[PDB]
Design a protein around this nucleic acid. Structure first.
Ligand SMILES: [Mg+2]
Ligand SMILES: [Zn+2]
Ligand SMILES: [Zn+2]
Ligand SMILES: [Zn+2]
Lengths: 56, 84, 46, 33, 263, 65, 56, 134
DNA sequence: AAGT
RNA sequence: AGGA
DNA sequence: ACTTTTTCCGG
């Protein structure tokens, strides 16, 4: 139950929630500190290469 | 055992799950530097590319729809209707 | 100059070393504090 | 006559120093009145 | 005389009561905003603490010091530290105040805004003098010490506006009112039995004409005439909280006009 | 715990007005209502600042070092 | 808790200042969240595939 | 202020509204190991062990303690301690990774045993921010 | 609070 | 020991 | 005669 059906995971973040009437229905406000910690692995491709190096 | 094309009985339409797994699969391949089957008219996101590939039914994938007994119906993303 | 540790109640400066006994001179009380850094701290007025 | 262990004393009790202490005494004892 | 008219009702060291006529509400409000948060003042913004033996913590006192109002008269001839070329501060961009206090007295020793001394060169301009409005000439009470309690620290006051910190607030409360007899129908009075009875009349009712019910609603009517009152904290003098505000706003509009010309 | 300089709501310098308030009460024998108003604190935000102040500092001073 | 398929929904990230996860007010009900100190979780997909699952 | 949220006057927060102090007392002691094999409150470096924290040991003085003025932050070492073996293993107490602030009071005392007893207070102010409950 |  |  | 569940998250 605790290690297989359920699991503690990576690429997960949690904080206090607050309402924003200027956000869209489908968007979630992510604080910089959390965006700066959470990381997506993008593959270097001819489409991204240029942007990707700038972020690197 | 494999059901022949002339004897297929599943939807002529594509499931929500089929479409979501095709776009995921093509996006993963397009992103893994796979050959793209359409003019990327300024396109740079592998999902948007995959969506465009599907739009022109130019995705070389085949859905193997399995039945509870094990028997299955092979349907092409070309033949599957995308009303959704 | 130099006041390593100040006593906690009488506030008399001690300046003792490691192996010079943790106790005050006149009164017992092993309490003893640390006397603020000479490397001075600055704060914004907000 | 003979020593038989140590009893934890409750603050402000008959056996505690603070019971027999004035505002000035307490402040001196670094204890909140 | 010209465009928008002013008629000052009451004046003092701390308060200007006036009436702004032949003006747009948007103009009188943009003016209200500016006086609250866009006029530059000068206040302590860096407190290098040397010795603190007080009952209060270093930063508690720090925050307090910034709230002490400093003379910001000839503030216009002090550069914003950012714009100055020195690493950190100089006489061109900052006023340096020192504060030393000690409980010599067997009684409680009080630490006042008067106990601040300017160590920097003032270049002969009116700035950095702690505002003492106090009757006994003491000014703000920063602290209190017993005996061996010493307070040693150095402070650097800089330009800044209230938009950056409320310490650079040149004005306290700004009283703003219009149409004391709701003749504009800009409000819907909540009541139990009578709107007119239950709601107290404004003092400004005297300076405007009562509605006189036997007349239709003047929809054509616009809001002009704004019964205002500006309060100075001490830094800049009342009149200047107004004048400086008027100017500050003009300068903002001019910057737009100017930045427009760059394109 | 020591008189707040400037009222939280509007900003009127209030750190000076303390001892004077404590005097208009003790020495001048006035009530709190008239004392605040002598000190020229008219808006309730300013009034509450002094009225509701608990000058804890004085108890902390009773401790030795 | 998560007794709903709607207690876990996919959103567009919007990087913003201040430490709270901001969220549109209409999405309040499905999650059952109030802003009285309620906290929330955020999981980040790592594949271009697990992403499609969320978005689609 | 919708759904149990609330709008706070920023102008007020600055004037001192809802600001609070916060203290945290980190504590440690020198442990004696039978044959008088004690631990030591000192500022360690390399010296065979190399099992030390990543935080700047540099805020420490020779007694293995910060002074009561120093602004601490990451996992900066608050108490430097070492234990030898049959040599300087690290036994250093760093500031809670999550935390940051200014050292307030450092107390050097004696344990009932006669061991070096240390308590370190770290102060911080907390200004009313956006997710803050009231 | 139920149920082998 | 405590939050929703 | 005899057993097992009960919402989700600093020391
Ligand atoms: Mg709630
Ligand atoms: Zn002593
Ligand atoms: Zn300069
Ligand atoms: Zn006020």
């Amino acid at each position: 139950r605790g290690n297989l059906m359920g699991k503690r995971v990576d690429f997960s973040a949690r904080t206090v929630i607050s309402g924003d009437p200027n956000l869209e229905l489908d968007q979630v406000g992510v604080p910089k500190s959390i965006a700066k910690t959470l990381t997506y692995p993008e593959v270097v491709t001819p489409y991204n290469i240029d942007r990707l190096t700038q972020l690197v | 055992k494999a059901i022949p094309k002339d004897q297929r009985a599943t939807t002529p339409y594509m499931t929500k799950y089929e479409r979501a797994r095709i776009l995921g699969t093509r996006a993963l391949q397009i992103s893994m530097n796979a050959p793209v089957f359409v003019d990327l008219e300024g396109e740079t996101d592998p999902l948007r590319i995959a969506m465009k590939e599907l739009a022109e039914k130019k995705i070389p994938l085949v859905i193997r729809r399995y039945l509870p007994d094990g028997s299955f119906e092979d349907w092409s993303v070309e033949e599957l209707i995308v009303d959704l | 100059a130099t006041l390593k540790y100040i006593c906690a109640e009488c506030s008399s400066k001690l300046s003792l070393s490691r192996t010079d006994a943790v106790r005050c001179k006149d009164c017992g009380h092993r309490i003893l504090l640390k006397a603020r850094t000479k490397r001075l701290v600055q704060f914004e007025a907000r | 006559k003979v020593f038989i262990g140590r009893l934890p004393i409750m603050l402000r009790s008959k056996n505690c120093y603070l019971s027999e202490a004035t505002e000035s005494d307490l402040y001196k004892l670094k204890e909140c009145p | 005389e010209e465009g928008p008219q002013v008629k000052i009702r009451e004046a003092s060291k701390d308060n200007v009561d006036f009436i702004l006529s032949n003006v747009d509400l948007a103009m009188a409000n943009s003016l209200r905003r500016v006086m609250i948060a866009e006029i530059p003042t000068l206040a302590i913004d860096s407190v290098e603490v040397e010795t603190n033996t007080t009952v209060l913590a270093d930063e508690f006192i720090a925050h307090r010091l910034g709230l002490i109002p400093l003379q910001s008269m000839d503030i216009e001839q002090l550069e914003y530290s950012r714009d100055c070329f020195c690493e950190d501060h100089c006489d061109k961009c900052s006023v340096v105040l020192t504060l030393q206090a000690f409980g010599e007295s067997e009684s409680t020793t009080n630490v006042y805004s008067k106990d601040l001394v300017i160590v920097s060169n003032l270049m002969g301009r009116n700035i950095g003098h702690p505002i003492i409005q106090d009757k006994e000439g003491n000014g703000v009470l920063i602290c209190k010490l017993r005996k061996g309690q010493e307070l040693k620290l150095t402070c650097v006051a800089k330009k800044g506006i209230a938009k950056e910190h409320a310490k650079w607030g040149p004005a306290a409360a700004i009283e703003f009112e219009y149409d004391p007899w709701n003749k504009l129908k800009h409000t819907d009075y909540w009541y139990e039995q009578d709107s007119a009875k239950e709601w107290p009349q404004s003092k400004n009712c005297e300076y405007e004409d009562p509605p006189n019910e036997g007349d239709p609603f003047d929809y054509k009517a616009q809001a002009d005439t704004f019964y205002m009152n500006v309060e100075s904290v001490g830094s800049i003098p009342v009149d200047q909280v107004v004048v400086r505000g008027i100017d500050t706003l003009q300068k903002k509009v001019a910057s737009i006009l100017l930045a427009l010309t760059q394109m | 715990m020591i008189v707040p300089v400037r009222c939280f709501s509007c900003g009127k310098v209030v750190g000076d007005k303390w001892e004077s308030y404590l005097n208009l009460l003790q020495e001048d024998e006035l009530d709190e209502g008239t004392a605040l108003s002598r000190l020229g604190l008219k808006r309730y935000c300013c009034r509450r600042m002094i009225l509701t102040h608990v000058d804890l500092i004085e108890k902390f001073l009773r401790y030795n070092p | 808790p998560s007794l709903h398929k709607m207690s876990m929904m996919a959103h567009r990230v919007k990087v913003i200042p201040y430490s709270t996860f901001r969220l549109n007010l209409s999405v309040t009900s499905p999650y059952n969240a109030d802003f009285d100190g309620d906290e929330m979780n955020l999981h980040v997909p790592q594949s271009e595939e697990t992403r499609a699952e969320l978005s689609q | 202020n919708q759904e149990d949220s609330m709008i706070m006057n920023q102008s007020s927060i600055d004037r001192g509204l809802f600001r609070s102090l916060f203290f945290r007392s980190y504590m440690d002691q020198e442990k004696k190991y039978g044959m008088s094999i004690t631990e030591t409150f000192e500022k360690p470096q390399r010296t065979n062990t190399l099992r030390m924290k990543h935080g700047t040991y540099d805020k420490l003085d020779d007694d293995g303690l910060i002074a009561p003025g120093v602004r601490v932050s990451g996992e900066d070492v608050i108490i430097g301690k070492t234990t030898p073996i049959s040599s300087k293993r690290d036994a250093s107490t760093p500031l809670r990774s999550t935390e940051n602030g200014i050292v307030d009071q450092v107390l050097v005392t004696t344990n009932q045993d006669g061991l070096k007893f240390v308590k370190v207070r770290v102060r911080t102010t907390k200004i009313p921010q956006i997710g803050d409950k009231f």
